[PDB]
């Protein structure tokens, strides 16, 4: 017996939908859900989605509260819908997927992923839920995550980090590193060799290697000398050039984090969504150097060094394709006299 | 187990709230309630009230579907709230009362009218519901309607007409004429002798006496002669004067109905609500004669003739108080040389 | 180059979307689309749909302006989506279907009905458009209308009437009677033998047979005598019983139309959508007789007489299934001593 | 001391803004203004404008309640703003002009039309208000109406009809025929000789000449014979051709009114505003004959006959410019062998 | 070919409007603009203006992305509109000006500033754009900024800082110090001698002189002694008095910044807009000392010392007018026995 009042009761008493019986009085005004507490209204939810307020409230209450793959990974793997859960997209304040399976009567296209409507869709399956590894076996299209091995299936080791209630973290008390499996038209795929983005924040950036510790601690010329990076344009690409009106390079998150410690800057996230490569309209506060579309990727500095050192530097310009987060990322590589001039995630 | 989805189920299947178990998917967008039918959204309700949409939807679904007193009568009797029902005000598309008793969790001030919060409020009681006459005997303040005798309680015969789902009618298959009773501060109050407004429409006006048939059929001078109305200013008051820029008189609904048959006119209902006396900004289409505040009352022509013929015509101006629909209506009576000049419901 | 301003230009200059190049300034405020004319905003469209205002405006501008099947027929045939057109539902002021094919970038699930997403959906095809009969032959699921013969395809003669810009009519200058064809799972399905509802209004009801002329002109007892309808409960079913608080029978539109000429009544259309059988909360103004759920069907009186006279009258109660508008309508037939007591479209 | 509560007080007590002191409690929710009456909210105004609700409420309360020129006339004369009044556009439910002079603090561009901001704007002046003829003499740009002679100013006799509170009428108790005057760049402009549209409705159309009575009463062939209209294509232009899918002609309101008596039809007013020529998407209910853009003008049939009989019929196609409501209306005249084929207000 | 979809395409791909061809699907819901990215909606813009959402989205996309004068400077100079650009007011999240010239079809009053509508308006001209110095030469009213000298015009050196995408900064990689020119009625003005506000933030306050470094580093009594400020009430005016319920003085930003390092406080910006003097409802968290209207100005401490030391201290109270940011700021100076008691930006 699903209801607005029952969903609200669960949110008030359990912090989310927990299948508990009960009802609380609710008022809906514009895009906000309120509940009466001692005669006064208390805001439970503000709808930031394009779904009707009561529908969005229910999907948000029914969000997955276990560590789940980051939306950018699910998107890159072609996930269309999730089996009997809601992957909440905290970057968009909305459901990661248009439709649901066995979650909400307004958004459900099926109650079970075995229904023929789900056969063409790449359904997300969670091996931590009983019967989902078997539902993936019977699924024509799908992506499966597991914590351990699956008999007869070769795994693709996913990223170390997962999203837990919108907090991207590498789990110590919970497992966040999953094995990934994918099926297309009934055939188990061999997932490609991939790098993973590190999903760090600018304000709380932490190095994850000795090279990253050295980048943040040493001065530009000492670091470039120590790691033999002369001729690889790290001065432009990673450190950033703030001497002209157009901000030069600054495409690796670690470089932005190093700059942030000394001088602040504005990053306008004009397409706010989870993605492998992020585009920002940056304005450096100290210098006034700015760039409308500054593509930024958070790779481990060692992985970025490996990518750039594995390229042919003999052509003026070329597209360099690198598998990152299971997707093909195109980079633009610009060279002159055997040295790099610039290397950036291609704006297309 | 009250819920938005259960209220919607009742509306879809029973035409209103009928206490039936069940749920239908609902979407709320802005001020409208929708339900999915054959894959598409069908509008169930549009909120025209100042309450939250889901709350107004529930009160409207729980509206009283039996003949009930017209809102103007309840207002005139000082009714604040109803016992365990919703009197829906079809003229305002809203609940006739702010709060409820045992109806909706968001608007309820009590579950039963015996609760101390209800003692100062004039509670409406319906003798057609088991135990409501007893609740009126125990209520400190209240208005009771019955279809018959209550032992020891002196009745007041109400109007012949009642509102059934927004249709004001004199019941033939249902009883619409009720006995009325009122209590103030624990004491049964004697309801005054009163006239009743006829609650007719301009477009479907029907005469309810031989005098009313004669007013609509006969010419002005021959009706005034037949009913000995010379010197009573019916030419001004009832027929209306359309010769000057300011429309003269036209305060009885029957006069407007007679005019409507020949020439149309605009009546701007600037305070849209049910009331004994209605104020309209009238514009006569044929002549361009207009009046910002034209007070109009729908009395039976015989009752209006009785009122005007029972007045002393020896003073220039005076207030004439007449009990109509249990309320004291003040009229302004203007005389000259023993004849009426004007007589109108006094604009406060 | 589809755009809001181009859609608005087409509406302003062509009365609808006509593929014309051009732009007009547009302002969107809340759910209304406006355009500047002589320095002031003029309303072009008010969104009554659950889609975003600019999206609903585009689908409405792109509505099919040729005579099209009434939405009740498309629904009864299981139509999910239309091929490269919008069937506008004038009863709901909304698109008859959630999604589109080659119409609008926001609602499109495909550009052509040959795309694999369309295979499971029943696509509506219009033989009057070049290549649509061929697309139906290749579609896994679909409904096709034509003005003539399709080689080798067994036709089903549809209703005489079609909807032209929201006006249901039997075409004299245009063809409104189509041949219908349906495919399920790649296989042409034989459409059943069916009656058709007449799609008439209560206020402008016109008889379409000598029997219907006789029902409206003749008194109840003489019509029943002339057409040998004694023992078939037409007094209850068709004429209606207004003697008790619950309105009896009154399930045929013609009976409501006959009553409407003498006494008015309120019909509350609580699920406002096009359907073969309509449910109304009726309140008779003359008597106060009312019914929360009064199922009403508009059959030709001759067709209803044929249905009722073709039933076995020897059982107390039974479900009578009749194909109407291609759908199986369940009726409840109640008999006593070989005569009908009641016969009504069964309330689910 | 202008205020929302004071405006509301004036509306409640005076039917409009009347400069009276006082305040009533007001609640604003979404686009509606409410006031408390007997403990419940009563709707005073619903904003259908693109202005903020409280601002639109004030302009509507301050609307001119005297007969004023119809908005189509003011527009045709290039009126930008009114001097110290609001011309309310009842066809758009909005102010006819964006800005005000001495009316409302939010919309005012000036308190008096003598302010330099008003010099480039064509200000509407009303000679019925003291000092407005003088303000017109001093205005650089303006339109003046008067009920009589202004010394030395050559008058233009306007239409017989004016708008009084949204009712277009020819005044009997008030004057609706004004003298018009216009100034451009400090210089009094000679207004051209013009025809006037009759501003009639389809549903309440009344003939205003013996020819118009003869058009409505007589059959097509006998009217054309009586008025010697053979070869002028009245069969197409005025009567309308409903034999093909595209509705032919039907450009004079009187022809639509004649058709309306026999068969109803839908007129979609897709640009809802007052204009000399109106464009409708028409659908004839009887035949299914339709036209996306059907230009309709309401001229007196005698005036239309005079216009068409005053044209040279020797060229295949040409633009015929006719001054109507002070504006140049372009008509398309199509001839063959010395006879008219079609003549219609040219679709721009 | 301007369009909503084209503006959205530019925002998605270029970070702002860049004149690029292309379209993306857009949905408008309430006041938010979304775009579809891989089947899900992504928020592009939330309207915080009083303009229609699609219009505000276009002006925001077309905002000037070069360093521009701060809105307080433009306002103080009487700028009404900008020539072919949008000065976006980041403090109000809205366009700094009501109308535009050659920017957006809904807000444009002209395509070029040479149009006669622009002659009375003080048009903002940017010498960094080709032809704008010449358009200022031909403009009757205007303000011109340049980076270098203009032949024949004497410059007014503006502030060192400018706004770059809402970040107020003193440019190192870009020029932010402009020469200002102003014309009124065709005559080049001699701009007055002025101080400039420093436009610093409380949280990231940086000293811009040795005196400012000393104010932040030294204790109150050491600083007052070093700079000979005894008898100038800096203890009250600049440091602030937190000993009584009403917070005393605290009118210079540097004093608030010094306090902020030790104890936090709430500044309620009740009129959120860019202005030379800002008014805050301050509440000191440590003491509970508060003030409803605390006027705060950010002057360089040396400039404030120069202003206060250049006043006559012999009268109880007087208005001291100081040109700051080209506007006349009134200060209230209160003295006793030849010493200052208080000196503050006058609340009027
Ligand atoms: C070997 N194998 N294990 C699985 C599984 N655990 O889901 C599966 C699924 C499809 C095809 C082969 C498979
Ligand atoms: C001498 N002079 N230079 C300019 C200019 N560059 O705009 C100008 C403008 C108006 C009047 C005199 C002027």
Swiss-Prot record, chains A, B, C, D, E:
Source domain of life: Viruses
Active site feature: 236 (proton donor), 251 (proton acceptor), 291 (for uridylate-specific endoribonuclease nsp15 activity)
Binding-site positions, uracil: 291-295, 342-346
Impact reported for residue 261 to R: In strain: Kappa/B.1.617.1
Catalysis performed (reactions): uridylyl-uridylyl-ribonucleotide-RNA = a 3'-end uridylyl-2',3'-cyclophospho-uridine-RNA + a 5'-end dephospho-ribonucleoside-RNA
Assembly and oligomerization: Homohexamer.
Section covered of the full-length record: 6453 to 6798 of 7096
Annotated site residues (Transition state stabilizer) in this chain: 291
Protein name per UniProt: Uridylate-specific endoribonuclease nsp15
Job of this protein: Plays a role in viral transcription/replication and prevents the simultaneous activation of host cell dsRNA sensors, such as MDA5/IFIH1, OAS, and PKR. Acts by degrading the 5'-polyuridines generated during replication of the poly(A) region of viral genomic and subgenomic RNAs. Catalyzes a two-step reaction in which a 2'3'-cyclic phosphate (2'3'-cP) is first generated by 2'-O transesterification, which is then hydrolyzed to a 3'-phosphate (3'-P). If not degraded, poly(U) RNA would hybridize with poly(A) RNA tails and activate host dsRNA sensors.
Organism phylogeny: Viruses, Riboviria, Orthornavirae, Pisuviricota, Pisoniviricetes
Compartment list: Host cytoplasm, Host perinuclear region
Location of the Nsp15 N-terminal oligomerization domain: 3-63
Cofactor(s) the protein requires to work: Mn(2+)
Site feature location: Uracil recognition site: 295
Residue span, AV-Nsp11N/CoV-Nsp15M domain: 64-189
Gene source species: Severe acute respiratory syndrome coronavirus 2 (2019-nCoV)
Domain NendoU: 206-345
Result when mutating residue 114 to I: In strain: Omicron/BA.2, Omicron/BA.2.12.1, Omicron/BA.2.75, Omicron/BA.4, Omicron/BA.5, Omicron/BQ.1.1, Omicron/XBB.1.5, Omicron/EG.5.1
Cofactor binding comment, as recorded: Likely affects Nsp15 binding to RNA.
